[PDB]
């Protein structure tokens with residue numbers, strides 16, 4: 001089971017992580033049943 | 049989940065949350081399927097005679 005927990009926070013700090021506490025609500029539980037050892041972040045390019 | 053008790057509540061459950069637990073860890077509220085409402089479970093009256 002792949003458990004994904006999520007939390008969305010409005011912040012106004014410029015560079016680093018704000019210091020505080022926010023509990024992450026569970027977002028989804030996926031019955032994927034696969035071996036995971038590596039992960040990748042997906043970004044979006046901007047073209048002009 | 050089986051049990052005995054009397055089934056309205058004012059507890060603001062979060063959407064993921066289904067049931068509720070007291071200090072004793074006994075279930076105090078549950079979310080019913082089909083209708084999604086939150087029912088407070090209070091143990092039936094008992095005591096010494």
Ligand SMILES: *[C@@H]1O[C@H](CO)[C@@H](O)[C@H](O)[C@H]1NC(C)=O
Pocket residue numbers: 081082083
């Ligand atoms: C059946 O249950 C689902 C969730 O458990 C609920 O969304 C749906 O409204 C229910 N349908 C009826 C007819 O009770």
